[PDB]
Design a binder for this molecule. Structure first.
Ligand SMILES: [Mg+2]
Ligand SMILES: [Mg+2]
Ligand SMILES: [Mg+2]
Ligand SMILES: [Mg+2]
Ligand SMILES: [Mg+2]
Ligand SMILES: [Mg+2]
Ligand SMILES: [Mg+2]
Ligand SMILES: [Mg+2]
Ligand SMILES: [Mg+2]
Ligand SMILES: [Mg+2]
Ligand SMILES: [Mg+2]
Ligand SMILES: [Mg+2]
Ligand SMILES: [Mg+2]
Ligand SMILES: [Mg+2]
Ligand SMILES: [Mg+2]
Ligand SMILES: [Mg+2]
Ligand SMILES: [Mg+2]
Ligand SMILES: [Mg+2]
Ligand SMILES: [Mg+2]
Ligand SMILES: [Mg+2]
Ligand SMILES: [Mg+2]
Ligand SMILES: [Mg+2]
Ligand SMILES: [Mg+2]
Ligand SMILES: [Mg+2]
Ligand SMILES: [Mg+2]
Ligand SMILES: [Mg+2]
Ligand SMILES: [Mg+2]
Ligand SMILES: [Mg+2]
Ligand SMILES: [Mg+2]
Ligand SMILES: [Mg+2]
Ligand SMILES: [Mg+2]
Ligand SMILES: [Mg+2]
Ligand SMILES: [Mg+2]
Lengths: 141, 197, 65, 110, 117
RNA sequence: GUAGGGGAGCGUUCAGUCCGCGGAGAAGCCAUACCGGAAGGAGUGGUGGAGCCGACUGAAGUGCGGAUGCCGGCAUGAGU
RNA sequence: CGAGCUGGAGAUACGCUUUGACUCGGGGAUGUCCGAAUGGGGAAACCCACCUCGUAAGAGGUAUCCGCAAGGAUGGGAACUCAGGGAACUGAAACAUCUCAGUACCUGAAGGAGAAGAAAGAGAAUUCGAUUCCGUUAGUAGCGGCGAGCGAACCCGGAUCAGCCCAAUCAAGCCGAAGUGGCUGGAAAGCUACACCUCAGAAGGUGAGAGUCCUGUAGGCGAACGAGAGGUCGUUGUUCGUGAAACGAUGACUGAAUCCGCGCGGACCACCGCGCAAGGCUAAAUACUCCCAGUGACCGAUAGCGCAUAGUACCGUGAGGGAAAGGUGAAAAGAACCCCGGGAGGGGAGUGAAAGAGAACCUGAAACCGUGGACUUACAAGCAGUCAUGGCACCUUAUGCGUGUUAUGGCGUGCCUAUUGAAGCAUGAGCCGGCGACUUAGACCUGACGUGCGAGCUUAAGUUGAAAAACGGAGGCGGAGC
């Protein structure tokens, strides 16, 4: 019973109606309207009576899923990672986690100390700037 | 950093939750814990339920009376409740992190108390209560506080059970509640420095 | 329950970085032989809406795609 | 809701037995058991006393009349006795014979 | 858990009905008419606070006018010659002087007139 | 100052916990000229007969003059 | 079990039982008539029979279908499950495809569950490996007057595991520790001075609150009996609305190969993969809850089921609808007896602590009706108040800022809702009680406050323990845009 709650960490709700204090009558709702009505459904994309922007517009293209590539960054194999190398499960037990996708390595930062990579694919400038700083890139067969 | 009782005398480990213990995270974990264990049970009926058949009762216009449809209605005596409680469950999963930090902060709050008694032994003969009362008496347990046991020895509990001024928490099942719920923690000692690590 | 994505919109509106929503320009099926040249060219494209009529779109999809 | 309900309709004593009133006005008095009603958990000790008026009832007796007889009681101010002490006197159950069961105190028996 | 009015309403209500006494018929006895009567009563209280501040001022005034005229002075002329000789008296007091204190009012008169001409 | 958004709070129950009262009398009810800025809350007196106030915290079937609202009681019309 | 019993029921008289009753557990025997009714009929509970044995009194049999017989079926069951049949209101702000929804309802069958099930499968890894269930993938892939809206599965984590065969311990009960003295009180359990028990401080009863009176609990025992193929045409199913329509699925027409063979991989073709149709059963996890038990930030008499009990009273030709109902006391000690009256009712008495509990029996609010008293009121015009003064009265938050009442004055258009505008001759309402309306759900969306970890944050289903919680990385959010 000692304790107490963090100042502002629990706000007391609104119970609308109840007095002129107070939220008299109406309950926020004003006077009449379709809004006034105890009834579901309005909803949120229902502009006017009308026809919507939503359906007034060109349907371009379609929808392909595709293979989407998991980001690996330079400044993350770099800086103070002190090359424990990429291996396989190693980068997983660090900071690049998904499954059921292939990993990609691309630029962003700068390059120094020599490292060999173990990725499923990579950008041209990436293999470029990592070989030119002392290390390979293992692309599968 | 605090002393034991019947075996060793170590206790200098166990780091603690400063600035100077927090009331907020406590109250959080407590009220949470209290919630998690409620029976979720207050059922009432609505119109669909109140055995009060659909049938239009009388004339939609004509009678000189206010208009009604059914007798199963919120404005009727007898009828169903409007906005009543139903069976639910006020439980959630408070994130690990703060369970640990609470628990801790409780222990602590009672160490700088200092209502801790770190215990390495227990001399309570064979499972008898009077022996508990005696041992107790000689560790500093006047009789004017609520005391919470945590050990692992069936005998000591069986001794610590009927005691009006004491509660008996077995092994791990320990919580910010019970502890703050009380005046004293029977620490014990065994799973304290090793539960540190 | 889980707020449905408006498949009405899965080929006609786009999110971004800043959060802004884009869509295309309109008039490219019988608004043709008109023409004019910079019209027909202008309309194949794409563009960000104003504001006011933004949030709606957003609420049409949760994933942003 | 019955009175022996919470008392497993159980009469700890018996018709005959001497008794002493624990709590009440009749604190401590002796009485043979004249009537022991287990379910209602009610019972008559020769102590109690009461003055009852049995109304007109022409037959028998034209006029009414009255009567000094005694109001029954609740087996929970009834107490069995200890021949030695004779007071507030619990009971243990032991075995004399020979599959005959009996009843001591802290110094048997009764 | 459910929570009947139980008690609260009787409380509120009595509060009103205890404000509500001396009132003629139903007003003093039924809640609705009572509370109601009191809405209007509210209006009358507020306004009539400032109002009485007016009314009294009026009263003092007519008494002074009297006073002046009791010799040969107008109210306006008396009070004006009592602004002129700077005799900065409240008029409530002036009424008091005027009706409870004769020869004093006499002098204040002679003064005002002097300062007037 | 109307619709409206914002701010601080009053009361009701159930609940955790502490202060604690009660057959030399609990709650509830009844009277009143005390207190608080207001929701409200205290003092004492009469009622009653066995339970309850206060602080902090939590959760709500949480505050009614209206709905020709619902249940119940009692008035008018009428000694007609 | 061991002393009382003779049902609620509260009444007399009759009795019964320590040779063991009454109550309890466990079997048996007897069980009229109706009802699947079933010997035939019938307007259910009634009518009339025929046959076998009996001395009669009686007893049995006499439906229909599957069967050689023996034997099984009929009818009922709140929901739960499967199947044949299958609505509409509604939404799309109109409607018709569509959505409501294979929902409501009807029906058939069946069980304590059921269904489903042992791959011509998912499928895309040349991986998994019967089903049902939950988590998740996932509002993703897709469906759609591409509108409203509709919405998977594989993988990944759990629950529980099974695969077999054929045709050439609880249910009655017993036993269980430890306090007395004084005090208030009508009454001790409370106050108090000293006590003892605890594997027992859960609870309930006892004249007011009992660890140590009682029944119990922790614990310990515990029974004779007792329970454990293809194709075509019209269609449809899955996210499947004729769309490129695969596949299954059947109504009508057609009815191929059987191993160098058959089926699928979403038109279709080769290739290359996964597979063995035409035969059956299958526990387990899962669903429900009439019923039994345990609990409760569920209700306590307008609540809670409709019912403190009743589907009754009452309404209805019927289907069907369908109430309000609670409290003397600690114990009947239930008021002998005198008084006015035919009575009803009351006034004593007497009991009790209290009859300020007396059977219209706990409190006893308000509207509403009255008796008495104060101050007032019969030349007066009124939303009934206000505010100022005088009169009279009173003195337990109370002799001054008084309180009650009043006369005279000034002043003054009930409330609510609806409105450009309400005293409105515009809506509502006899009065007072009590019931009466902005909520809940989702691990959805987006924000404000807060918090814990912080380039890191987090579990869900479940598992184990459970007077507590911990485990659980499967997935989720952040990480890079176009
Ligand atoms: Mg507000
Ligand atoms: Mg309105
Ligand atoms: Mg309007
Ligand atoms: Mg009318
Ligand atoms: Mg002025
Ligand atoms: Mg409380
Ligand atoms: Mg209460
Ligand atoms: Mg009303
Ligand atoms: Mg009318
Ligand atoms: Mg007449
Ligand atoms: Mg008339
Ligand atoms: Mg007449
Ligand atoms: Mg018995
Ligand atoms: Mg017979
Ligand atoms: Mg027949
Ligand atoms: Mg229609
Ligand atoms: Mg429509
Ligand atoms: Mg059937
Ligand atoms: Mg076809
Ligand atoms: Mg179809
Ligand atoms: Mg096919
Ligand atoms: Mg009541
Ligand atoms: Mg009811
Ligand atoms: Mg009489
Ligand atoms: Mg009078
Ligand atoms: Mg006149
Ligand atoms: Mg007159
Ligand atoms: Mg209103
Ligand atoms: Mg108008
Ligand atoms: Mg009028
Ligand atoms: Mg009107
Ligand atoms: Mg109108
Ligand atoms: Mg935040």
């Amino acid at each position: 019973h000692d304790l107490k709650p963090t100042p502002g960490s629990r706000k007391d709700r609104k119970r609308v109606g109840r007095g002129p204090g107070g939220t008299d009558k109406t309950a926020g709702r004003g006077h009449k309207g379709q809004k006034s009505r105890s009834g579901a459904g309005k909803g949120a994309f229902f502009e006017g009576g009308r026809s919507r922007l939503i359906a007034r517009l060109p349907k371009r293209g379609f929808n392909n899923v595709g293979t989407t590539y998991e980001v690996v960054k330079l400044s993350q194999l770099q800086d103070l990672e002190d090359t424990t190398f990429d291996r396989d499960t190693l980068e997983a037990y660090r900071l690049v986690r998904r499954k059921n996708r292939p990993v990609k390595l691309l630029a962003s930062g700068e390059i120094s100390r020599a490292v060999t990579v173990h990725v499923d694919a990579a950008s041209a400038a990436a293999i470029k700037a990592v070989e030119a700083a002392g290390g390979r890139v293992v692309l599968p067969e | 950093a605090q002393i034991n009782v019947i075996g060793q005398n170590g206790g200098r480990t166990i780091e603690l939750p400063l600035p100077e213990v927090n009331s907020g995270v406590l109250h959080e974990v407590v009220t949470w814990q209290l919630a998690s264990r409620r029976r979720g049970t207050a059922s009432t009926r609505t119109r669909a339920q109140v055995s009060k058949t659909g049938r239009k009762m009388y004339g939609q216009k004509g009678t000189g009376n206010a208009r009604h449809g059914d007798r199963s209605v919120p404005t009727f005596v007898g009828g169903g409740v409007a906005f009543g409680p139903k069976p639910r469950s006020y439980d959630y999963t408070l994130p690990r992190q703060v369970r640990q930090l609470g628990l801790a902060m409780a222990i602590a709050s009672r160490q700088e108390g200092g209502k801790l008694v770190a215990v390495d032994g227990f001399d309570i003969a064979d499972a008898k209560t009077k022996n508990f009362i005696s041992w107790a008496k000689q560790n500093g347990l006047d009789g004017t506080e609520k005391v919470l046991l945590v050990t692992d020895d069936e005998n000591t509990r069986r001794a610590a059970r009927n005691v009006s001024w004491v509660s008996v928490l077995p092994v791990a099942g320990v919580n910010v509640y019970d502890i703050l719920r009380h005046d004293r923690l029977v620490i014990d000692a065994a799973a304290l420095e090793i539960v540190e690590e | 329950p889980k707020m449905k994505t408006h498949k009405m919109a899965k080929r006609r509106i786009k999110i971004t970085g800043t959060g802004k929503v884009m869509a295309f320009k309109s008039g490219k099926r019988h608004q043709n032989t008109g023409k004019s040249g910079d019209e027909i060219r202008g309309k194949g494209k794409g563009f960000v809406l104003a504001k006011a009529e933004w949030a709606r779109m957003k609420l049409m999809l949760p994933r942003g795609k | 809701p019955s009175a022996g309900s919470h008392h497993n309709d159980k009469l700890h004593f018996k018709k005959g037995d001497t008794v002493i009133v624990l709590s009440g006005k009749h604190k401590g008095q002796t009485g043979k058991v004249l009537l022991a009603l287990p379910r209602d958990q009610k019972v008559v000790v020769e102590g109690v006393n009461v003055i009852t008026k049995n109304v007109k009832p022409s037959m028998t007796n034209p006029q009414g009349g009255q009567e000094q007889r005694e109001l029954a009681l609740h087996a929970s101010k009834v107490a069995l006795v200890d021949p030695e002490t004779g007071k507030a006197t619990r009971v243990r159950k032991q075995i004399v014979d020979g599959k005959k069961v009996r009843v001591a105190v802290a110094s048997g028996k009764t | 858990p459910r929570a009947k009015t139980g008690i609260v309403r009787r409380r509120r209500h009595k509060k009103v009905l205890k404000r509500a006494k001396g009132f003629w018929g139903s007003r003093s006895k039924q809640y609705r008419n009572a509370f109601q009567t009191l809405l209007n009563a509210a209006t009358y209280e507020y306004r009539d606070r400032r109002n009485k501040k007016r009314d009294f001022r009026r009263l003092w005034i007519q008494r002074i006018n009297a006073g002046a005229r009791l010799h040969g002075m107008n109210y306006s002329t008396f009070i004006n010659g009592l602004k002129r000789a700077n005799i900065d008296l409240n008029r409530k007091v002036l009424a008091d002087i005027a009706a409870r204190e004769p020869e004093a009012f006499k002098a204040l008169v002679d003064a005002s007139r002097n300062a007037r001409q």
